[PDB]
Design an enzyme around this catalytic site. Sequence first.
Site, mmCIF file in Angstrom:
data_model
loop_
_atom_site.group_PDB
_atom_site.id
_atom_site.type_symbol
_atom_site.label_atom_id
_atom_site.label_comp_id
_atom_site.label_asym_id
_atom_site.label_seq_id
_atom_site.Cartn_x
_atom_site.Cartn_y
_atom_site.Cartn_z
ATOM 1 C CB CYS A 32 1.718 -0.566 -0.819
ATOM 2 S SG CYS A 32 0.549 -0.916 0.529
ATOM 3 C CB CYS A 35 2.359 0.643 2.492
ATOM 4 S SG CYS A 35 1.826 -1.050 2.128
#
Length: 106
Positions: A32, A35
């Site tokens: 991700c 993230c």
Amino acid sequence: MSIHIKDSDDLKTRLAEAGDKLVVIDFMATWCGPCKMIGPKLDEMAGEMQDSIVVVKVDVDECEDIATEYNINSMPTFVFVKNGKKIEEFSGANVDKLRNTILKLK
């Protein structure tokens, strides 16, 4: 700097152990991109709020069952819990909204 969640039972225990503190559940992953950008920003806020907030990281690849339990459909997702009760949720690597949610709920 943050408690990495091992499994569903671990998350349930962390929520019970948090007492009255705001729990921030950071749903993230190694793959991700967003993230990895918002994550260090969350750690820094947590660092200046050790007394009021608990941040727990849920790796969606490690905890597929938790990701389904929390209906994770976007990455990252931040779920806010107080006294075992889910107060709020939002998705995306939105720093301004993350800071606001933490400030209003802690």
